[model samples]
Target chain A: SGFRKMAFPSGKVEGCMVQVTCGTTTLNGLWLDDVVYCPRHVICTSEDMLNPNYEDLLIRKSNHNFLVQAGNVQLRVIGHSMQNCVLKLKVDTANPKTPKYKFVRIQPGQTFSVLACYNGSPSGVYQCAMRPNFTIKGSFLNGSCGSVGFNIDYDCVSFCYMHHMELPTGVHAGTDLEGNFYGPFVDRQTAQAAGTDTTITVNVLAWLYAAVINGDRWFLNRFTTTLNDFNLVAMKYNYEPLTQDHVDILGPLSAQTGIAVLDMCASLKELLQNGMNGRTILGSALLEDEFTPFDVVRQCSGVT
Target chain B: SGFRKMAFPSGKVEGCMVQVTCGTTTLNGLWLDDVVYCPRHVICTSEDMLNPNYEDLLIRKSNHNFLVQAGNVQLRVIGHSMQNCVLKLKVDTANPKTPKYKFVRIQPGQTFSVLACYNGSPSGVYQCAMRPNFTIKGSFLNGSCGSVGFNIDYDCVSFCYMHHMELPTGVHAGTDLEGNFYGPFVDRQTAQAAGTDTTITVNVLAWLYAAVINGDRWFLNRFTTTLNDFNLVAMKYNYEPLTQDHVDILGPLSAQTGIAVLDMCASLKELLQNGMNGRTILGSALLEDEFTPFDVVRQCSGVT
Candidate 1:
């Protein structure tokens, strides 16, 4: 059994189409509206350049044998063996009150996995000999399952907005939007008031900070010199100067972890270390650093 | 000619008073209402506590020979020589658009000072041998004096809110308010809406960042463990981990400069450096680093 999923590549899928043929059956609208997973193996191709239509695509499990190719479209092919299926861990971080940093420690030689159709599966999953644990802040996530030491797991790092302010609408991050990072980031009110196609702006610093936290090294490297020069001038304007330590330690950590190398590496490191310590929460659901970010919503905006 | 000044020390001057006797003419209220500069070399006393009156105090210059005493007031004595006047440099930062970071370079072996009563004075002010210059980012302050090289002068660092949002009212920083830094930091809207003496909250991150920029070591040290502990949990929450370089480089810098050492030291250093590079404005009157801080007022609050 095999499966296939189709969607448009960001920016290039304004008008596109995908068709898959498996032996005697044919499928259309694979690249229209949204992602559509189909069953049966089939040869696929997007034959239109513009003005394609969505043919009522529905969500369903896919199992098929197909030869696939896409035109300005993203095509995901899954094999029957589940050998190519990718399963990664995700946590809840959508709210300010969630102790998003809380985790249970992954003990040595513990097998953790869940299998489901169109969800996390055991196919292509690597069993860990040693894994980072997030349990025992005071209690363990799984009862009677306690262990320690650090091992790099998919969930070892939690990505978040470094600042406390609510992100403006249209500014989605932490996911791949085409090949480039995507975020228009306009506030809700402004977006509505504009009426027509609203213009968007970027929070360069905020985004960069987010990227560093996300361990997106590509983004960090892309803007390294620009940031360096900016700081270079700012130093003259009476800002603190970036010392050699930033270049030495943070530089490498950034390269490896995808965190932006920074002059305030010590403070950032301290915060991270603190964040890592399960004991620091003091039983509160909130994780705090030396500096709690300024949250507009919590501080103002909606307060009565 | 001799003069004297008197006021109450922060927190200790609720019901304090001061009296100065220059031969025969005595002055009271020197510690009431506001600061008072009196004349003559005379003796003074504050003699009362818990209950004191402000006897019609006003701002004026005085030259008196008197003895001084205070109940719990601060008394400052100035001598005939201007050498101990303690004149330092300050720039405009009260407004957001004021190119607050703009500066002119101080030429090496050049003279810079002014003589003014109650303002900047030339008493005991040392002329610099090599001072940092801030000219021609297009033009220079005080005309044709152009030069370079980093100097630890008073005006070299322009302290600012790292985030672009407008600071809440009552949240005063930069200047010494009492001794412990002051800032209830309640937004105007929230204050008005609450109706009854609205409570206040602190933006720990915002204030800490500001303190680092201002090089306030006392503030940074006071909360070091607290912040470190916070970040430790945050990192486990999947935040970017701070590196050792932060501990080494920023640790020393924070102590020497009073800026809070941080894990994001590299980014902070870059921003400060860019703030220094007079050329970075690119002709605009704003300093930009790798990240433009997320500004609430400019981005949302006031916009239509």
Candidate 2:
């Protein structure tokens, strides 16, 4: 008997095999790195938009999803079909402890940005894909199994940069009620008590500390230009360029900020990817790409 | 009557003192921050959807906008009547640049999202109230004299973290197509030639080097947690924890990466705050706040 070949989308079969399926394989978030032969499962803490790179991370942690697809039909197995239902995969990056998705009532055309998703396993305490996943399912949202429409709210992308400490805020601070005021004092209290004049200065440095990992010239160039510009402004006011004290405080704070930002960025990336906030629980999920999205096999149906 | 106090709304007077009406008065933004003593004037980049925080920022950067409501009739000067029109204020962050207005046509209600305002003084550009200030206006944008409707699209927040290389493409340095996989290869070209395998690793370190400024337990504690987690993962794979070389690389890289991320975040914060994306080029604008926005004194009574 010749080996039966099946169509697994090219590049789709990358993650390390967590499950060895003969014909019908089911990918599970039940375990972290249970290497299954399935390809379309990406379990993450947040929806994909905010933290789009979670899977590669989890996979790498698990000996990596280091498999290669040599040919179109790289596997010698029986192919099978299973109804594709959009599922929400949940993992919490924030608290890493607590979790939601109160299973509910719904309508026909009404799609859920989230469905039920579980963490802690099949028999464990299932919570809706963590808290950030919570939200009101609406017209703009999508339920791939339902509509796949564009619910591109992009909340995760915007929110992750929270605390709105943009230099822009400093720029447009405009006027307060009496017209004699400004805006955004990163730590407003620090500014008011005259305790700290440049709070964002510290955070901005903290931000740099994080990027230091990228080793990019583009980044450094950006910083130099920034400081020099500040220096120019300082010179105009007959003051010295960049304060040494500010320079002095950069190191330690960053290491702390560094890890914090990463976990936060990682978490947000996941959330943004799928918009699967509140709707997922007990049995939850969402989506992504690189995704080489493909199929699992079962008893060969069509003998070639 | 020396000073008749009008019961001006508590939150009405905001923004910079464009009129200096009385002691000191500002108008904040129109629509979102509009609470002027007049009506019909709302100056902003977008209808505030794309620039929700403009006023707060502008307010904080001054001596700042500080004047009391003495007699509540704070106008030592003449209170003139100018039509409240939308205007886009131009102040380039990178340049010692100085800057428009016009009026024009389009569809039923297609606002161009821009109009003009003056730089140093009026009798100069003086058109923050004109509709494209009279140009062969493009699509449905708004110039003060006209309406730039809701071209309020803020792309700022989403781009700050771009290059997604915050994780520098990989914590695992995962593979891509062509089966020639190289994990976390920022400069994939170098990795392919086997030149450098751990680039971001160094940058991540640089990030910390910069942070060394803040001498404290918090930072070291953070880094320890991070590497510890990395080590825990490494152990699972029968590999030793991060090598010293790897650890050494973390400091400067983090410094470099940190600054870069900050600048980007700061800039985006600015862009998101003002909705100042290009496509704006005239003497007007739009918003939805209140305070009966109107004209800018001397430059009132539009001719065209």
Candidate 3:
């Protein structure tokens, strides 16, 4: 035998014209004969717009089957001013026995359609996760700039290994193709990669330091003379140690040249080793060596 | 020669209820009727309990006038559990021109009575103030109990003055009670009141240095014995001209005694003066005559 029970047992009615009434009623100036009943019929008039009996409306629909007409159901996007916003739709199944579905990443500026199916049985609550995309990178210099110069010469054969190397007496080397003189030590990568290339890189670094330690005026004059005729005298003299008083005057210059000094030292070491092997080469000829000079210089100097 | 003209104007009803007949004969299916009338009605329910609208429940009636009922109409006492609380009331009468009243200094565990005039018009804010009542005194011991012994005869005299002037070896001679140990030199009142009252009442301060110095231990014993008898010791012995070590031992005692070594010298001078004057009086008590043996002993050894 099949049996049926009302979902809302207390308020259900079999007739179509059923209504529920809720409120206190007075009789003969006394609170008496008050009863709760479902009205047999309901008359909907224009007057009800001002004061709607919402409770009655809910009670009337309580245990009844509903015919939900489907068309375009508009969901209002209210309150949020995000033009770049996204909607995520998830369908939760009533069956716990089924395996859970994987979530998908959704992009903003679009609508998502979903078909909601509530099983004949009830189910647990559903939830979804939301997150925003973000990123970060080094944008600007954040610390003090540091540099230094060291003099090297024929007499100082182990100049590359000198921890307390003195500053050269001339201007710094390493000007760009435009002839604009960059500060001491040129760039970090080229200096760092100097070792990987021909051993002459050390000589070049020593010469550069010589020019840096000297007054920039001296370096400019030597550089001008050398660039014109490749004057080895001007270049040679540039490698002489600067006087202590001159160094004191250029103290801040030395401080700013810290990275440059390290790179220059590494390059000098490489050049000296290569020079000992008689592999005297320059630029791309040195670049052909096993180590990439540019890369090393870039990494050490934090610049490209 | 008078001419008169009479004019009659046609009258018509501007608004009316009408029944429209669709056909020459009465319509068989349905008929449309429009009624024109002014809407008016009288509610028979009690105005005190009900009205045509629901807002009547919140309206207040006073002196035949209506006003919207407000929040709490009674003053409340609020304060910490252990603190005394008070209540204050303030009425804003800028609009209605009401009299202002204030109550102050209400104590704890007390209630404020609401004025009968405020029954219907208690529509303002109230404030309250609370003040606490309380007292504090300091104490110390005087010599009345027993004769505390002194070690150094000089310190004994000084200590006597410091500790209420009750000298351990002094004889009570002068009527004024201001004299020191030996007769005639000190008097009663002056001796008794000495050191007991100071410009500022101070508690007996411990003389730790007395124990460290004066290896005798007598000064320390006497000092400790009368430690509770006075407020702060003056701490004057550490004055200029004396090294820190000397002052360290004597400073605290001298401060407590209220008598400097110089003051002792001045007392000796007074004794000499009195001795000289007494010699001139009576037969055989001439200036050349030796002072009485007792007076001589006192002059030499009494005050140290």
Candidate 4:
């Protein structure tokens, strides 16, 4: 029905806006911050088109990473420069002593899914850079991927790596002519930029606000109600497992209107314990009041 | 063949360390009691949240349940609020009873599943309760599903005539193939006995024990996909955003052997071949331990 702004997921630049549109009407942003997002969305962008930060972010996130029990992920080829290059995929080890999982020979226009299992005992877990080593055949490459185009699903959810593009070779070329901002190369000071990239993180409440204003709650409550059905959903005030309360109804949004802040509620049904569901998320949003009609009976707004 | 806590099935449980994977793979001489975890994942509760007892998580958190047989599984949705709405699917019991299975019409956006089945001797097979007296064109109604979603369709597992317990002449009904609860015999009372019904009691260790070390890797995945896909995807969602796998396997397999699981076999075959270079094909139900790799390649090719 409308737009709503949600707090940062992994950023501190303030809340970002989510655009809600039904049908062909892609209503221009009233969501917030001008930088808007769609439900079932992922967008990657760097401060500069030449100098990238995703690779840096990847290393930052994986600083303490380790295997948490084999998981899988997908590396989708969203775009590329070389038609016949093998895109290499790998992870950085947190301890340096251990080696992360890897993938090889992935081509453009395809997905490189890694299925694996490893740590969790004092065990390695948590170290996820979301960064992968890429190459155009044997030599290293440059590239990026954003909104648009895709599908070929057998429905195997990969845990490790999922990239949808592999472009190569950039430029510092003269003549004001040839070369690009995405595929290939790096120049410093004031010349050509190295590369551009983005890392997407779901703010968790993005859909909650959209659904609330428009009235949608199934996918949000699917796992919530599911967990509650089994006496699993909880609200542990401090982290005390014994005092946790298990109930079905998630509280109202009076606490935080559009989820522009941390929910931090102690006894709410909708709140997902940081690590309880293995989701590692802080909480959730539940908007009720069945308003009107909708097109697809979709959940979580994910790209198919 | 036994439970092993590993990365999740569909979710990226690997990154979460949720330990929600189920153990349906029967290996090295295991059966029945030992191979009981039906679906492969579940959300954990507070009591066992610290250290899960995953073995007890079966159907405990799902809206469905089933009786497994070597050749196939007969799914029976366990708990639903409405007695009138049931999840009905077909099962073979060799002879007598309901005779041949039947299919009918369903309104758009309504589940074709009829959730009623009672009385089948040793279990596994039961008569579905789908004889409701629905008007071919009942007054249009308003209903909701998921957080979003509707429709009527020709092809789906459903009951053409739901149980009404009455005949065209209101003379109570008599013996006939695919009749209601009031079937075959003259009265409902007589039909309830062993004399007129089907009794199926295949030992759990029956079909299961044979495949333990028999190298049926594809069996579990294929069967799981068949069960999960139809029940979760098609039956629940009514097949939206159709993918090639539908055409690659399900759509075409329906053209080959109206058998769902076999179609799953073909689907799995097509899945493995997509972007797959030289990788090992381990754990397939269709894989015969005695056959060479050529046999599997041939069987898989036989479908796609």
Candidate 5:
């Protein structure tokens, strides 16, 4: 008997596009990426939005580039929609060593398009990104004018696209934007010149780090917001969240911030919990035998 | 897939001296013809009983003049020790309408070699027939002489052969000595001189008719004797039994003839049973409904 060799190739980049001729047939709702997503909330974005309605809002469309050759090629982009927001594209090819292509702006009711070229030369697979646009304000009220506080509100939306072919093979990119610097700082001399109260020169700084970091267009497009939506988008891109080692710093930071870093991580933990039921699901922390229990005092009023 | 066509000329005979070679590592078993034996009980005349030992009772060593061949082959002869015998062979060329090769005086213990002239001709396939040297008496000592009573003491031996080839194709050759002839008597003088044993003559006539009408050498060869040593043979030349129709007639005649037909039939049946079992195990018989019921019967018969 003779043995047969497997025929599929391996080690491919993510978001690579391949055009297949469907001849004269009209294909709909075809899944280009092998990923799952929540239907209603997650919307796919496209360049054209002629009829701006919620129902028509989420319907993404591609230009009929191959209309002369054959029927339409449905790009089953795997990602949730960025509701009421337009994602801007910026190709930063300035650095020869490390070129970066990204989405620069995201505003409600906006649209953007980028032609993902194959170039007929093998370079690498392509993936897309989206970001949320946000703003922060700080003010003081009447009697409590001296006490200043800030209020923050975020508009959550998603963006999705279908590829004419399968997504390139790799995990989607992710990054931390928590401590990125982006704010306005007032000079001491300037504050002293505008002094309304008798006090030493003070520096007034408007810290917009959270809005710039968390609400930046880069971060929003780079990472998915909701765990479910992220998972769906990851699946569409054929990616899985990074393991602890992959995001070693992010893991502890996420713990400190109480944020479920990986979208699927919380669900996976829930599944593990359900699987364990009454039994304990042991982790590396539980395996270590270094800690002892401590007691806490209810009050500290000098033995009252 | 491409279709492959293969053609073999008719009247191509392979002698019992050629050897088959496999050029490729893997060869299909269904492509070639292998060795086979004709099953029948041959009578040993006084000429054959000269050696009277089993070791010397081979047809090849006997004085059989049957000769015709073209390629590689193997000859296997079987019988219960018949002595010295001289066998003669003649191809029936005169009767082209219904041609047959005749064997004459095949003495026991006589061995004959297969000779052929290849002379750049294509390889051929051939089969040979063995006939009894002379007439012999058959008696059932445990039962009433010339009665319809069954006898359990008589033991006769039959001969058959196995081959390492696919299923047999074309018309197979067969011969039997037990047959009857009817004569028209004109006067009492001619009939009376024929005997005080006139009833016995009538019985013999009936038996001969029954043998001629229903007797089958091929059936017996395939069902009874294992001259081919089918039990020990493996690979392509697996043995298969005669169909139920063939068995229905062969089984009864062999039983009533005071010949060793049961043992031969039993051996053939065993080989067929095993082959069928193998086919079932290999899932080859799933599509064949005819043999399915027969397999059940064979199972019930406890023949494995």
Candidate 6:
């Protein structure tokens, strides 16, 4: 729930600090010269750590080259120099290869998000790096740090080639100026011809995570996202402000939350907001506890 | 459940007869030069048809080049000489690219199966082409046909190269002598180091189809088969008998039914048969009604 500096290493010139916020608790983890520190666990840089709370949390512990994971959410600290650092993130709810989740050039006073990687609605996945520029700023987060704030410059460099996105239909996906991925917008005028329109809808995002509780681990179930579903979500993930008009006019038969949504007549907004009252329609947040198997599928923090 | 010949074509010397069995009704459809015939739906050879019984039943109606679809199950008749014919079947339960489902060279007395594509115990997915060499043969199915039984040779020619099977872990999958796929067979000796073993299991194949009833169309949500899951199942799909010894020694963490199975102590068989009752453990059959969206995803009978 708060922050504190971990034990300083004996032979290190610079140290690393990280904070993890899961549900209501926040644990301050740190990386010293040759060791990593967490509230409940500590280990040498070469060893891996899985504590009771934050599972699969790894830190390279090497200077300017650390990868961190807490459940399905990950933060990669690479391309670091004395005055510059490049930060990258990978999440389970969206395509990890895209720019929004992959590389974030940040130094200070930035309210950045990998949350954009998720389509439904927003959650705590979005965060603000603490200004004065030290820890993170977000709902359910309170932390501060010292040192390394001396005019740091971080550039989101391209570490890999951006892949050309394509749907199962072999249609190309959307792209943005930032080279981030988004949108396979479709108009429902052809819905009648396709015979795909349906009112009964179960949220797929709900099922993907829900099935996990039933022991149908999402990691083991490879059939969660169709190639088309993935392309559509990847496009939607890059959308800055997914407007109501956009959703009404070009809404897919399947919503970003994986709901069977076809709003051809502009009635989708009301249906999402009211018709499905308790159920989430627009967007949903993935929590650390539920998406554990995602780490098994794509370990975001392992060596590249 | 029965078959009868339809009216012969007006201008063609050779006609095509197709038998469709959904549940209780069997429609004997015939392709006569410019028109196609079915018990309920009839359309021109140039058009498509979706009758009340068989939902996406498309027949090209072209001579020696017909693509037939009855729900998720599809049969392709291609590369035909007067004395030879090549038939391919694609079923939703398994990988469609492998030889077991892709190209089956048959003429007379061939009890062939696209069924081996499925990993679970047995179901009607397997079929025997009726002989004295005429129609199809199996349980609850009675059918007969009259036509070219004249020493027909159907060569299972390689229409496409077999893909190199791989798991998401970047490991190579298994293959057999016939150039068919099989086994990613893992030894659980390292399961203890990985911390992956768990008894809380789920039949994913159950969820894949079950979710459809909940309005979560499997076609729209692509994440179903992970590269690894697809590879593993592709391998398993090619297994001839899938012996109990094989299941005991190298069964995966996920079964073909998408079940979370880890039988390190050789207790999987007992656990599958006894521990879970009314719940199908080994393998389950995929019916036509449940996997309809599968057609939407991989329309097997569509033009190549």
The per-residue C-alpha lDDT of model 2 at residue A120 equals 10
- Tens digit of lDDT per residue, candidate 4, span B250-293? 33323333434344433433433341222222211121112212
Top-TM-score structure, candidate number: 6
* Clash count of each predicted structure: 122, 186, 47, 59, 52, 26
TM-score-better candidate, 1 vs 3: 1
lDDT of each: 0.22, 0.20, 0.18, 0.21, 0.20, 0.23
CAPRI grade, predicted model 3: incorrect
Off by over 4 Å in 4: A1-179, A183-205, A216-260, A264-304, B1-304
The 10 consecutive residues of candidate 6 chain A with the worst lDDT sum are A1-10
Worst 10 residues of 5 chain A by lDDT: A199-208
Sort all candidates by TM-score, best to worst. 6, 4, 2, 1, 5, 3
Q: What does candidate 6's lDDT look like per residue over B19-66, in tens digits?
A: 433233333323222232222222112122211222223233233333
Instruction: Give the worst 10-residue stretch by lDDT in candidate 5 chain B.
Output: B1-10
**TM-score versus the correct structure, for each prediction:** 0.15, 0.16, 0.09, 0.19, 0.12, 0.20
Off by over 4 Å in 2: A1-135, A139-304, B1-26, B30-149, B153-304
In the range A160-267, model 5's lDDT, one tens digit per residue, is 222121112111111111111112211011221111111000000000111122222111123224445444533443333333342343343344334445532433
- lDDT for each residue of candidate 2 in B77-128, tens digit (9 for 90 to 100): 2112222122223221211110011122222111112111111001000011
Q: Between prediction 3 and prediction 6, which has the larger DockQ? A: 6
Residues B1-304, candidate 3, lDDT per residue (tens digit)? 0000000000000001111111121100000011111101101123321223323321321211211111222111121010011001111212121112211222211111110001111111111101011000000012111111111121111111101122322211111111112222221223332121111111011112221221212222212212221111222221112223333433444464554433322322232234333221111121111111221222212121
Best by DockQ: 4
| Model 1 chain B weakest 10-residue run by lDDT | B1-10
TM-score: which is higher, 3 or 4?
Answer: 4
Q: For residues A121-158, could you state the per-residue lDDT of candidate 2 as single tens digits?
A: 01000001101111211111011111111111211100
DockQ, per model, reads: 0.01, 0.01, 0.00, 0.02, 0.00, 0.01
Clashes of 1: 122
